[PDB]
Coordinates of all heavy atoms in Angstrom, one line a residue:
Chain B
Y1706 N 64.0 -32.4 82.4 CA 64.8 -32.3 83.6 C 64.6 -33.5 84.4 O 63.8 -33.5 85.4 CB 64.5 -31.0 84.3 CG 64.8 -29.8 83.5 CD1 63.8 -29.2 82.8 CD2 66.0 -29.2 83.7 CE1 64.2 -28.0 82.0 CE2 66.4 -28.1 83.0 CZ 65.5 -27.4 82.2 OH 65.8 -26.4 81.5
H1707 N 65.3 -34.6 84.0 CA 65.1 -35.9 84.7 C 65.6 -35.9 86.2 O 65.1 -36.8 86.9 CB 65.9 -37.0 84.0 CG 67.2 -36.6 83.4 ND1 68.4 -36.6 84.3 CD2 67.7 -36.1 82.3 CE1 69.4 -36.1 83.6 NE2 69.1 -35.9 82.5
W1708 N 66.5 -35.0 86.6 CA 67.0 -35.1 88.0 C 66.0 -34.3 89.0 O 66.4 -34.2 90.1 CB 68.3 -34.4 88.1 CG 68.3 -32.9 87.7 CD1 67.9 -31.8 88.5 CD2 68.9 -32.3 86.5 NE1 68.1 -30.6 87.8 CE2 68.7 -30.9 86.6 CE3 69.5 -32.8 85.3 CZ2 69.1 -30.0 85.7 CZ3 69.8 -31.9 84.4 CH2 69.7 -30.6 84.5
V1709 N 64.8 -33.9 88.5 CA 63.8 -33.3 89.3 C 62.7 -34.3 89.5 O 62.0 -34.8 88.5 CB 63.3 -32.0 88.8 CG1 62.2 -31.4 89.6 CG2 64.5 -31.0 88.7
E1710 N 62.2 -34.6 90.7 CA 61.2 -35.5 91.1 C 59.8 -34.9 91.0 O 58.9 -35.4 90.3 CB 61.4 -36.2 92.4 CG 60.3 -37.1 92.9 CD 60.5 -37.5 94.2 OE1 61.6 -37.3 94.9 OE2 59.6 -38.2 94.7
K1711 N 59.6 -33.8 91.7 CA 58.3 -33.2 91.9 C 58.4 -31.7 91.5 O 59.3 -31.0 92.0 CB 57.8 -33.4 93.3 CG 56.3 -32.9 93.6 CD 55.4 -33.9 92.9 CE 54.0 -33.7 93.5 NZ 53.5 -32.3 93.2
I1712 N 57.4 -31.2 90.8 CA 57.3 -29.8 90.4 C 56.6 -29.1 91.5 O 55.4 -29.5 91.9 CB 56.7 -29.6 89.0 CG1 57.7 -29.8 87.9 CG2 56.2 -28.2 89.0 CD1 57.2 -29.5 86.6
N1713 N 57.2 -28.1 92.1 CA 56.5 -27.3 93.2 C 55.8 -26.1 92.6 O 56.4 -25.1 92.2 CB 57.5 -26.9 94.3 CG 56.9 -26.1 95.3 OD1 55.8 -26.2 95.7 ND2 57.8 -25.3 96.0
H1714 N 54.5 -26.2 92.5 CA 53.6 -25.2 91.8 C 53.5 -24.0 92.9 O 52.7 -24.1 93.8 CB 52.3 -25.7 91.4 CG 52.4 -26.8 90.4 ND1 52.4 -26.5 89.0 CD2 52.6 -28.1 90.5 CE1 52.5 -27.7 88.4 NE2 52.6 -28.6 89.2
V1715 N 54.3 -22.9 92.7 CA 54.2 -21.8 93.6 C 53.6 -20.6 93.0 O 53.3 -19.7 93.7 CB 55.7 -21.5 94.1 CG1 56.3 -22.8 94.6 CG2 56.5 -20.9 92.9
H1716 N 53.5 -20.4 91.7 CA 53.0 -19.2 91.1 C 51.5 -19.2 91.1 O 50.8 -20.2 90.7 CB 53.5 -19.0 89.7 CG 55.0 -18.8 89.6 ND1 55.5 -17.5 90.0 CD2 56.1 -19.5 89.4 CE1 56.9 -17.6 89.9 NE2 57.2 -18.8 89.4
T1717 N 51.0 -18.1 91.5 CA 49.5 -17.8 91.6 C 49.1 -16.6 90.8 O 49.9 -16.1 89.9 CB 49.1 -17.7 93.1 OG1 49.5 -16.4 93.5 CG2 49.7 -18.7 93.9
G1718 N 47.9 -16.0 91.0 CA 47.5 -14.8 90.4 C 48.0 -13.6 91.0 O 47.9 -12.5 90.4
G1719 N 48.7 -13.7 92.2 CA 49.2 -12.5 92.9 C 50.7 -12.3 92.6 O 51.2 -11.2 92.7
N1720 N 51.4 -13.4 92.2 CA 52.9 -13.3 92.0 C 53.1 -13.5 90.5 O 54.3 -13.6 90.1 CB 53.6 -14.4 92.8 CG 53.0 -15.7 92.7 OD1 52.3 -16.1 91.7 ND2 53.2 -16.5 93.8
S1721 N 52.2 -13.5 89.7 CA 52.3 -13.5 88.2 C 51.8 -12.2 87.6 O 51.1 -11.5 88.2 CB 51.5 -14.7 87.6 OG 52.0 -16.0 87.9
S1722 N 52.3 -12.0 86.4 CA 51.9 -10.7 85.8 C 50.4 -10.7 85.4 O 49.8 -11.7 85.1 CB 52.7 -10.5 84.4 OG 52.5 -11.6 83.6
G1723 N 49.8 -9.5 85.7 CA 48.4 -9.3 85.4 C 48.1 -9.2 83.9 O 49.0 -8.9 83.1
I1724 N 46.8 -9.4 83.6 CA 46.4 -9.3 82.2 C 45.7 -7.9 82.1 O 44.6 -7.7 82.6 CB 45.4 -10.4 81.8 CG1 46.0 -11.7 82.1 CG2 45.1 -10.4 80.3 CD1 47.4 -12.1 81.4
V1725 N 46.3 -7.1 81.3 CA 45.8 -5.7 81.1 C 46.0 -5.2 79.7 O 46.6 -5.8 78.9 CB 46.6 -4.7 82.1 CG1 46.5 -5.1 83.5 CG2 48.1 -4.6 81.6
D1726 N 45.3 -4.1 79.4 CA 45.4 -3.4 78.1 C 46.3 -2.2 78.3 O 46.7 -1.8 79.4 CB 43.9 -2.9 77.7 CG 42.9 -4.0 77.7 OD1 43.3 -5.1 77.9 OD2 41.7 -3.7 77.6
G1727 N 46.7 -1.7 77.2 CA 47.6 -0.5 77.1 C 48.4 -0.5 75.8 O 48.4 -1.4 75.0
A1728 N 49.2 0.6 75.7 CA 50.0 0.9 74.6 C 51.2 1.7 75.0 O 51.1 2.4 76.0 CB 49.2 1.6 73.4
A1729 N 52.2 1.8 74.1 CA 53.4 2.6 74.4 C 54.0 3.0 73.1 O 53.9 2.4 72.1 CB 54.4 1.9 75.3
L1730 N 54.6 4.2 73.1 CA 55.3 4.8 72.0 C 56.7 5.3 72.3 O 56.8 5.9 73.4 CB 54.5 5.9 71.3 CG 53.4 5.5 70.4 CD1 52.9 6.8 69.6 CD2 53.8 4.5 69.3

Side-chain angles (χ1 to χ4, degrees):
Chain B
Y1706 294 93
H1707 42 80
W1708 66 74
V1709 177
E1710 172 186 356
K1711 188 70 165 56
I1712 284 188
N1713 179 23
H1714 296 267
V1715 308
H1716 289 288
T1717 72
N1720 47 25
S1721 295
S1722 61
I1724 307 300
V1725 302
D1726 309 349
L1730 279 191

